[PDB]
Write a protein that binds this ligand. Structure first.
Ligand SMILES: C=CC1=C(C)/C(=C/C2=NC(=C\c3[nH]c(/C=C4\NC(=O)[C@H](C)[C@H]4CC)c(C)c3CCC(=O)O)/C(CCC(=O)O)=C2C)NC1=O
Ligand SMILES: C=CC1=C(C)/C(=C/C2=NC(=C\c3[nH]c(/C=C4\NC(=O)[C@H](C)[C@H]4CC)c(C)c3CCC(=O)O)/C(CCC(=O)O)=C2C)NC1=O
Lengths: 46, 478, 537
């Protein structure tokens, strides 16, 4: 039950059948507010 | 005049000539001055591009659809988000400081608000459309994750406008609040009207000193700060939050269409142990998500209503088919009985003296006392239904106790009676968990609703009337 | 296998191969002849079709693409126009360089922060500036099997406050559209579609906005349209299902929006590294160039720029593509980034409302069917069995049909359009000869069923359904051909909507609408009730 991000998939024909194989086969443990605070840090502006 | 929280500014200007008429005591300090005085030009307090943006906003006939406005200060250059609204006297601007001074990150956050909102709504849509509790649980989980508060819950408003918590998500350090009820008095009608008008209300902290609003002496109608989001909390509710332990609040409304005009179904409130001033994009993300929440909840409500009507019709026709075969006294002798046609704890049937109990029913002597009451008082009526035997004029009300409190009766001719009982509203509430407090509110609710049952809904009226008419036809044939 | 998509994949591959073969030899692709020729395809053809569709190595000439590796920000692929777009041209843009040296230092730090991330990152897209000329760029980052692909688009150079104002104005327009959608009387779908079409046309600003609905046969139909007066109408059109390859539908289900800036511009090639096995995967990038077939279609029809968005509902979790909303222009048009997200929000609201209306309509239809059944039972109990077809309501009200009949010890009761007595004797003889041990029979078309007399019957009735009340008494339902109610205000060599309509009318010739499962189960219920009643007597 996480927001996550869209993951893209590609169609490949194997074994006489259509399959949509995944593209890529440490989960997030912090709320989105913490991510907003950490990433949107303009400290390097100085 | 009024009071505002000490984290924003208040300025009121004239629509026609951009003439300032009122300002908050906090505006002259944090904005960058030390000039403001009284009767100056608002555009002179910002840069040229900000002045052009403000003029364009003023020209537009809808004050909405242009909020917020990213304007900049003049004496210091720091940004200030602005929200505009009309008070039918002038134009009011609210300025809240922005923590992201880098121009590059501003558009990134503005777009990420939309991205987060659409992602949350896409997560919401995936749930099956067959229940409401899962919907509320998912919504509170998503809102808690997005906002990072300490407690998120959903309040539902009943017919008598008394609230009830139906979902909860909290850090595993505090007592749970799921299942609590409180009286309708805790929510004045003004707050409901404001929520139906502006679907947001947030509090940074309750221990901060409010800031007085300075007014001009050319007006006598004072100021209508109803539309403002910077208004200070009332003394009563600030004290309430003080005893509760929560310092920050964030309430958004769930709105349905209903018999058209809108109806306030409930609220989503958040509590934090310390002060919390959330950034703007997350606020707009939650605001966008709650619209889809309202849409889906309306859909669920209508679907549940249709399914309930269908099931009621099915059980009514099964009862009719049962009654058609052999004697009509066989209604109470089979598993699908009177109790299955309406949500109730007990029912009964009187037929030629013989009395057939069902569920929680009183003894035959009490039944015949009720019957003689009914012939004494209401003889020409066709049916009766009240939520409390007490307060209705029964001297033998205490004999039943807290078991036969609800009432619903539909006569057959003068003597055969169809009966529906309901117990007091205390056996369906568990809530295992002088000074204003949720516990005192629960105790007051228990006291006021004592010796009363849940109100009978209209669909119950149609069900009992249809069954009664079918019964009347059945004896008319014989 | 039995699914329509599984069969349609081979047809799409064959059509693509035929188009490529015609193109490489310099002829004109014949639409109707190719459609009629095909109705047994090896693995190589399907593999080549899928690889060409997804990995084409061609992008639209309005945005550059740069792909780097996650390890050391080393470039492993780029586009030819990337050198010109950045102002790079007077090696600084050569494969194996560092991607952080092409933008400003702050932009490099922001990109590095956006790179090392987790399941969800909070910088997507990012606002960056070019190192040389300072051109703003909307950088969209998505990950592939070999690296991270960065799509760069030009941004309007102005005050950032203006950009924020435009974004918030677009979002407020979307919110107002949703609010106006909410305040609507429920129970109908056409009004909802018209309101959505008008609101989308106001929001975007294209020249024609259309709504496509996909039936059970996977073909399409237009139900709502907002023209620009002088444009020719397209409402009521029906086109064959093969006009939409299943790969396009899967892509639309993957990414919600897809835009084409200009179909008359030359696509830009994409270079690659020798170490890589196969060509780059262009399934997740929004700059992927369209194939030649659709470009030729749009060029012939007249549209220069297009924009198609998907309507997704919940099916019984699982996502089902109900249809698409499309926009067409007569010139080059490239909307900014936030408008796409606003449109996606509006489409989410539209899908939710569509799911409610569908469920409500299904429940209402079931209630009406049950009411009709109990009423007919009451009439059957009250009077003789032959009276169920005499006085309204009658059998017609049970299911959507144009006629019905009842046979009862040699007595035939016509209703609406139906064959005469001799043709019913022929059809009952055919049924008893072929379909003996069966409790029911549903045929979409009598010709495909195998009726020798179907040609003589004509287009009056073509579809039928029969319930075996007894061994000698039967209940019939009749329907006319699909072309009867298909009406639109409008040499199939070129690709034009007229040719599509003619091909659709050709394929569905002598065929009716499919009998849905709801009608079938209602028929079964009434058949069981009638069987019980007649066995009682
Ligand atoms: C757990 C119990 C609980 C309760 C009973 C509760 C009540 C409540 N009371 C609410 C509001 C108010 N309630 C009151 C008034 C009173 N509350 C009481 O308990 C008294 C009956 C009365 C003061 C004499 C006022 C003036 C407001 C508006 C405050 C403002 O906007 O400045 C709200 C709306 C949103 C918010 O909480 O800011 C709620 C949800 N909130 C809770 O979390
Ligand atoms: C009024 C007629 C009409 C039609 C028949 C129509 C078809 C259509 N055809 C569509 C798509 C495609 N159709 C095709 C292929 C073909 N179309 C044909 O007519 C041929 C049978 C085939 C050529 C291989 C392809 C490759 C696409 C995807 C193009 C891309 O995005 O790269 C779409 C959805 C995408 C969009 O509209 O931009 C539509 C809506 N659009 C219309 O407006």
């Amino acid at each position: 039950c996480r927001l996550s991000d869209q993951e893209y998939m590609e169609l490949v024909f194997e074994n006489g059948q259509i399959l949509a194989k995944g593209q890529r086969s440490n989960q997030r443990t912090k709320s989105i507010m913490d991510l907003y605070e950490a990433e949107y840090n303009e400290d390097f502006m100085k | 005049g009024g009071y505002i929280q000490p984290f924003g500014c208040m300025i009121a200007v004239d629509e026609s000539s951009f003439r300032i008429i009122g300002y908050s005591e906090n505006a002259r300090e944090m904005l960058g001055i030390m000039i403001l005085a009284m009767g100056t030009d608002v555009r002179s307090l910002f840069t040229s591009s900000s002045s052009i943006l403000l003029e364009r906003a003023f020209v537009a006939r809808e004050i909405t659809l242009l909020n917020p406005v990213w304007i900049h200060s003049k004496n210091t250059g720091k940004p200030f988000y602005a929200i505009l609204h009309r008070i039918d006297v002038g134009v009011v601007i609210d300025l809240e400081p922005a923590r992201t001074e880098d121009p590059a990150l501003s558009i990134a956050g503005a777009v990420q608000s939309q991205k987060l909102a659409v992602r949350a709504i896409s997560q919401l849509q995936a749930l099956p459309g067959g229940d409401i509790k899962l919907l509320c649980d998912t919504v509170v989980e998503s809102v808690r994750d997005l906002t990072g508060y300490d407690r998120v819950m959903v309040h539902k408003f009943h017919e008598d406008e008394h609230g009830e918590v139906v979902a909860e998500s909290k850090r595993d350090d505090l007592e749970p609040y799921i299942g609590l009820h409180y009286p309708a008095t805790d929510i004045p009608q003004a707050s409901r009207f404001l929520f139906k008008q502006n679907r947001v209300r947030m509090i940074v902290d309750c221990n901060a000193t409010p800031v007085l609003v300075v007014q001009d002496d050319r007006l006598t109608q004072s100021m209508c700060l109803v539309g403002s989001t910077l208004r200070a909390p009332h003394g009563c509710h600030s004290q309430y939050m003080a005893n509760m332990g929560s310092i920050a609040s964030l309430a958004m409304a769930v709105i349905i269409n209903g018999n058209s005009s809108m109806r306030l179904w409930g609220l989503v409130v958040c509590h934090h142990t310390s002060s919390r001033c959330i950034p703007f994009p997350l606020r707009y993300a939650c605001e966008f998500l709650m619209q889809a929440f309202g849409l889906q909840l309306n859909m669920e409500l209508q679907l549940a209503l249709q399914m309930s009507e269908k099931r009621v019709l099915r059980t009514q026709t099964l009862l009719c088919d049962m009654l058609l075969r052999d004697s009509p006294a066989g209604i109470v002798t089979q598993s699908p009985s009177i109790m299955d046609l309406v949500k109730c704890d007990g029912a009964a049937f009187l037929y030629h003296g013989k009395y057939y109990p069902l569920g929680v029913a009183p003894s035959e002597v009490q039944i015949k006392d009720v019957v003689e009451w009914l012939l004494a008082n209401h003889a020409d009526s066709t049916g009766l239904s009240t939520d409390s035997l007490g307060d209705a004029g029964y001297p033998g009300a205490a004999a039943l106790g807290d078991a036969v409190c609800g009432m619903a009766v539909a006569y057959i001719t003068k003597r055969d009676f169809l009966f529906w009982f309901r117990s007091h509203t205390a056996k369906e509430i568990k809530w295992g968990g002088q000074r204003m407090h949720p516990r005192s509110s629960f105790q007051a609710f228990l006291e006021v609703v004592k010796s009363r049952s849940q109100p009978w809904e209209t669909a119950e009226m149609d069900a009992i009337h249809s069954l009664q008419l079918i019964l009347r036809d059945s004896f008319k044939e014989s």
